[PDB]
Amino acid sequence: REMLYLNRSDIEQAGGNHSQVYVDALTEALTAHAHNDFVQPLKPYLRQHIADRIIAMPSHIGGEHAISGIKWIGSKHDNPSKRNMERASGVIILNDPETNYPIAVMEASLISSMRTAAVSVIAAKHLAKKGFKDLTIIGCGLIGDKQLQSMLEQFDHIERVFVYDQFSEACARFVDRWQQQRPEINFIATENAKEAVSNGEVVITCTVTDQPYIEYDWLQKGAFISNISIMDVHKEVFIKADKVVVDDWSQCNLHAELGQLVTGDIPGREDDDEIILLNPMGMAIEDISSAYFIYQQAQQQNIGTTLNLY
Amino acid sequence: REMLYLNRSDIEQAGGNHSQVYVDALTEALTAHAHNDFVQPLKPYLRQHIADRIIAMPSHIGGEHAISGIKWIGSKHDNPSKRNMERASGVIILNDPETNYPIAVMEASLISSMRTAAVSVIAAKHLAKKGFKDLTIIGCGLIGDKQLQSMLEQFDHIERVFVYDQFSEACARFVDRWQQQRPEINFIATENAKEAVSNGEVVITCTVTDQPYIEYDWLQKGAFISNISIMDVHKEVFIKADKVVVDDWSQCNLHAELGQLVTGDIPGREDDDEIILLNPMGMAIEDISSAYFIYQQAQQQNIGTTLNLY
Ligand SMILES: NC(=O)C1=CN([C@@H]2O[C@H](COP(=O)(O)OP(=O)(O)OC[C@H]3O[C@@H](n4cnc5c(N)ncnc54)[C@H](O)[C@@H]3O)[C@@H](O)[C@H]2O)C=CC1
Ligand SMILES: NC(=O)C1=CN([C@@H]2O[C@H](COP(=O)(O)OP(=O)(O)OC[C@H]3O[C@@H](n4cnc5c(N)ncnc54)[C@H](O)[C@@H]3O)[C@@H](O)[C@H]2O)C=CC1
Ligand SMILES: N[C@@H](CN[C@@H](CCC(=O)O)C(=O)O)C(=O)O
Ligand SMILES: N[C@@H](CN[C@@H](CCC(=O)O)C(=O)O)C(=O)O
Ligand SMILES: [Cl-]
Ligand SMILES: [Cl-]
């Protein structure tokens, strides 16, 4: 009985640091979600602050290439502040549905951040205006960085990126390094959240806030907002938005669930005036499908450390 | 960021194949449970049969040597039958409560079976008659084997062991091999469950049944029964038993919870006529405390494979 171990470096080497593999994996997974060919229990929170927890996210995906597993992801808001460590960390375990035996142990933080960015990309394909040019990011942390990276990889027509962080220094670092990575694009450090949001055709919230600040009349007409960090958006926006989209309804306790957009069962953006809001809680099937996708490529390229179970 | 990997062989080498380390670990853990110095969410079942599932069991134990983690344990009743693999398998992850980062990845099946046997031993210390000589095991699988091993290690006064399995061949193998391990003890293969149970001062159920068969008037007066497999015991026994003990009440949806027996807050057996029933659902704090105990000894004896997280 063997298990393939894949650290973050191995995952990158297997192609886990580019958005396309996650877009591909989620596309098939979200299709499976719409066809209800999955099992996804409620995720229990282990708290001993909102960003101080470890969440167990188990799921099963059906099919001929059926896969099971869990994401065991921890978090401490203090980690970057007081320890110079990433806030989130954890492992992903994959399981053979035939025996339920574990077949893979994989680092989770990179996969988690990249699938989350892929959620925004996929939603933008259906909900954002065609050829949108202004992107807005709030929160210059790990998640926000991968959000920006993925959107740039997937949308070549992006010309300006408006960035804001409550911590001015965090925003300054973020803008400066990305300005070097993409010189032809103007990265604009705003002085408040309102200036950044009101200048964005696509707005992504990547903070750790516990109280909303996003007001409805900030949003441009035709704007699409991927509410990744959930708590950033005022209730009025949920009411005044032309279309509200979630990833999984029962999990969020309505225009559509994200899976129905990819299957064409429910249309996405229908005009360039619609203000569309995405509220994705994050699903375990996203982590498991992404992990199983990467794990297979690693096996192909002989990447990873083989462990014995017994 | 490093993680110590410990397979089943490493766990044995670190002393994970003797009951005493589990009795020690649970004793402190059950003490912590009684003092409510723990966090233990409800465990979600992942089903895609009763023994066909994967269970996420996360918990946190407080203190100066506080520890967090999860047991991700899968099961397939078909595994021994059609594949010659153990029914249960899985991994245990340990986490540093300060950062919630993972610090250990450990095989779970051995630890799981041994802590479960330690639950029976500890309960027997309080609920079984002093110097009991007749032990009864129903179910000759992996769990039942470790149940027998641990009881023999902890109770030298055991003279006879009555064994039964619905599958006659399973019972025959079990009895024969254990008769060679302990020749001075009479291992008696019974022809029905009733004969085995009615001859036991301590009765342990280790099957995978879904319907009760244990009747009240089978039980001797003074008997103690550790209902490990849960479903073996008829409802009448719960009513007619002099004392009913569980491991965790809220988890089982009453004389005492097991933790209160170890703290002396509630007495155990008070006379040798009391028929006492233990109904242990199994707690994550049992797996996590046992794992953290073993993990520490492995670090001392330089046992295990060091992995990099990034
Ligand atoms: N929906 C999903 O599936 C996922 C959601 N999330 C969420 O994304 C966030 C994680 O971000 P990370 O980069 O990993 O952690 P992080 O701590 O490294 O990033 C936080 C950054 O946002 C900034 N920020 C905080 N609060 C703010 C505010 N009120 N206003 C404006 N700007 C602000 C902070 O200064 C910090 O720079 C968490 O809230 C997490 O819950 C995380 C992963 C996936
Ligand atoms: N309370 C706790 O914390 C724990 C409870 N359990 C339970 O212990 C059982 C696992 O046993 P394993 O040895 O690991 O699996 P196993 O499949 O290897 O053992 C099953 C054995 O019991 C026999 N058996 C089944 N049904 C029966 C019946 N109606 N009557 C009489 N005899 C019978 C089977 O023939 C088989 O030999 C499961 O029911 C599991 O849920 C397992 C682990 C810890
Ligand atoms: N929206 C959820 C976050 N759930 C995320 C957790 C990922 C992480 O903590 O880095 C996930 O889906 O994995 C929340 O606010 O608690
Ligand atoms: N009593 C529970 C069993 N819970 C066990 C699972 C362990 C295993 O499946 O080997 C555990 O506590 O780990 C049930 O009947 O579902
Ligand atoms: Cl916490
Ligand atoms: Cl299953």
CA distance to A284, B235, B239, per residue, from B254 (Å):
38, 14, 10
Residue (of A6, A76, A86) closest to A46 by Cα position:
A76
Length of chain A: 310
Q: Which amino acid is at A306?
A: T
What's the rounded Cα separation, in Å, for the pair A71 and B102? 12
CA distance to A115, A127, A297, B176, per residue, from A153 (Å):
14, 18, 21, 66
> Is A11 within 8 Å of chain B by CB?
no
Please answer whether residues B152 and B186 qualify as being in contact, where contact means their C-beta atoms are separated by less than 8 angstroms.
no
What's the rounded Cα separation, in Å, for the pair B247 and A186? 61
What's the rounded Cα separation, in Å, for the pair B211 and B230? 10
In this structure, the residues whose C-beta lies within 6 A of any atom of ligand 2 are B 80, 87-88, 112, 116, 138-144, 165-167, 170, 193, 206-209, 228-229, 280-282
A100 and B52 within 8 Å at the Cβ level: the answer is: yes
What's the rounded Cα separation, in Å, for the pair B139 and A125? 56
Of chain A, the end-to-end C-alpha distance in Å amounts to 7
Instruction: Name all contacts of A24-29 with Cβ < 8 Å and 24+ positions apart.
Output: A24/A293, A25/A115, A25/A118, A25/A289, A25/A290, A25/A292, A25/A293, A26/A115, A26/A118, A26/A119, A26/A122, A26/A286, A26/A289, A26/A290, A27/A122, A27/A262, A28/A289, A29/A61, A29/A285, A29/A286, A29/A288, A29/A289, A29/A290
Helix (H) / strand (E) element for B43: namely: none
Please answer whether residues A218 and A197 qualify as being in contact, where contact means their C-beta atoms are separated by less than 8 angstroms.
yes
Residue (of B170, B145, A84, B102) closest to B161 by Cα position:
B145
Near ion ligand 5, which residues have CB within 5 Å?
A: A 48, 52-53
CA of residue A223 relative to chain centroid, distance: 19
Please answer whether residues B55 and B43 qualify as being in contact, where contact means their C-beta atoms are separated by less than 8 angstroms.
yes
> Is A93 within 8 Å of chain B by CB?
yes
For A232, the 3-state DSSP assignment is: coil
Residue (of B101, B3, B244, B85) closest to A305 by Cα position:
B3
> Is A113 within 8 Å of chain B by CB?
no
Edge-to-edge order in the sheet of strand A224-226 = A186-189, A160-164, A134-138, A202-205, A224-226, A276-279, A243-246, A256-257
CA distance B309 to chain A (A): 5
What's the rounded Cα separation, in Å, for the pair B25 and B133? 26
Query: Going by C-beta distance under 8 Å and a sequence separation of 6 or more, which residues neighbour residue A71?
Result: A55, A56, A57, A90, A91, A92, A108, A112, A284, A287, A288, A291
Q: Chain B: residue nearest A102 by CA? A: B90
Helix (H) / strand (E) element for A239: namely: helix A235-240
This structure's resolution (Å) is 2.4
Please answer whether residues A237 and A219 qualify as being in contact, where contact means their C-beta atoms are separated by less than 8 angstroms.
yes
Query: Going by C-beta distance under 8 Å and a sequence separation of 6 or more, which residues neighbour residue B84?
Result: none
A305 and B309 within 8 Å at the Cβ level: the answer is: no
For strand B2-6 and strand B305-308, is the pairing parallel, antiparallel, or unpaired? antiparallel
What's the rounded Cα separation, in Å, for the pair B26 and B118? 7
What's the rounded Cα separation, in Å, for the pair B307 and B310? 9
Testing ligand 4's pocket by substitution, the residue of B46, B57, B112, B289 carrying the most ligand atoms inside 8 A of its CB is B112
Is residue A27 classed exposed, middle or buried when 0-12, 13-18 and 19+ CB atoms within 10 A define those classes?
A: middle
User: CB atoms < 10 A from the CB of B124, how many?
Assistant: 25
Q: Which amino acid is at B288?
A: I
Q: Which residues pair with B71 in a beta bridge?
A: B57, B92
Pairs across A and B, CB distance < 8 A: 147
Q: What residue owns the CA closest to ligand 4's atom 12?
A: B282
What's the rounded Cα separation, in Å, for the pair A80 and B143? 44
A281 Cβ closer than 6 Å to some ligand 3 atom: yes
Helix (H) / strand (E) element for B35: namely: none
Q: Which amino acid is at A201?
A: E
What's the rounded Cα separation, in Å, for the pair A60 and A286? 11
Length of chain B: 310
Q: Chain B: residue nearest A310 by CA? A: B8
Helix (H) / strand (E) element for B276: namely: strand B276-279
What's the rounded Cα separation, in Å, for the pair A258 and B94? 34
Is residue B141 classed exposed, middle or buried when 0-12, 13-18 and 19+ CB atoms within 10 A define those classes?
A: buried
Q: Which amino acid is at A22?
A: Y
Longest dimension (CA), chain B: 60
Helices and strands of chain A, counted as H and E runs: 11, 16
Helices (H), B136-247: 142-154, 168-181, 193-197, 235-240
A72 and B52 within 8 Å at the Cβ level: the answer is: no
B97 interaction partners in chain A (CB closer than 8 Å): 48
What's the rounded Cα separation, in Å, for the pair A14 and A300? 9
Counting Cα atoms < 13 Å in the Cβ hemisphere of A107 gives 27
Please answer whether residues B231 and B164 qualify as being in contact, where contact means their C-beta atoms are separated by less than 8 angstroms.
no
Counting Cα atoms < 13 Å in the Cβ hemisphere of B140 gives 24
What's the rounded Cα separation, in Å, for the pair B27 and B61? 13
B99 and A90 within 8 Å at the Cβ level: the answer is: no
Domains and CATH numbers, chain A: 1-128+283-310 (3.30.1780.10), 129-282 (3.40.50.720)
A39 and B48 within 8 Å at the Cβ level: the answer is: yes
What's the rounded Cα separation, in Å, for the pair A287 and A16? 12
Q: Read off the DSSP letter of residue A14.
A: I
What's the rounded Cα separation, in Å, for the pair A56 and A86? 19
Q: Which residue has the tokens 């809220």?
A: B250
What's the rounded Cα separation, in Å, for the pair A48 and B58? 12
Please answer whether residues B102 and B128 qualify as being in contact, where contact means their C-beta atoms are separated by less than 8 angstroms.
no
Q: Which residues pair with A61 in a beta bridge?
A: A38, A67
What's the rounded Cα separation, in Å, for the pair B19 and B29? 15
